[PDB]
Amino acid sequence: DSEAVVPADAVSFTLLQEQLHSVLDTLSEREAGVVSMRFGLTDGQPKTLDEIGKVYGVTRERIRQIESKTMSKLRHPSRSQVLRDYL
DNA sequence: CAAGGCACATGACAACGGTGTTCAGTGCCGCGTTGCCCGATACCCCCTACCCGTAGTTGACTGGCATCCGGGCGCCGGGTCGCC
């Protein structure tokens, strides 16, 4: 069957979740939060940049600028060795 | 031989030297924080092409199918008709 949850894949996904969440915890609180909402780690629906700029109280271009800032920071080789292997 | 008079240096005396802080103000020059501008993207419309369901088609045409055996083995249990 195809509907079976392969234990190896499920456990790898859980480990990826934990490692990624730790990596965001390395980032600043606001930066980690905004990138999380932009990619919906907390909830299955990611929020657009303007969509993030309502609960947090930032403007769509301001939140956009920090989204660019988050993507850069997670792109430095520091917080990249761990997540390269998980793909 | 002892007392009184002049040289140089001396206990303090402030005020400059030079340099380190101070609160102070104002910028200097990098991050941001936000108004635009567009650009793309979801979402209404019209058109017809094709999928899918319904309804006919009148010479006559009137009862089917091939089963199934070489288990094997025994028991249960009920039915089933003879029995006297």
Backbone angles phi, psi at A17, to 5 degrees: -60, -50
- The CA–CA distances, whole Å, from A53 to A32, A66, A73, A78, A87 equal 15, 11, 20, 29, 30
Q: Which nucleotide is nearest to A59 (CA to C1')?
A: B34
A48 touches strand B (CB under 7 A): no
Q: How far is the CA of A3 from the C1' of B38 (A)?
A: 46
> Using the 8-state DSSP alphabet, how is residue A58 labeled?
-
- Residue A9 is encoded by which pair of tokens? 């894949």
A58 CB and strand B closer than 7 A: yes
Contact A35, A70 (CB under 8 A): yes
Rounded to whole angstroms, the distance from the CA of residue A57 to the C1' of nucleotide B51 is 53
* Distance (Å, whole) CA A78 – CA A63: 24
Task: Report which of A75, A20, A45, A48 is spatially closest to residue A56, judged by C-alpha positions.
Answer: A48
- Solved by what technique? cryo-EM
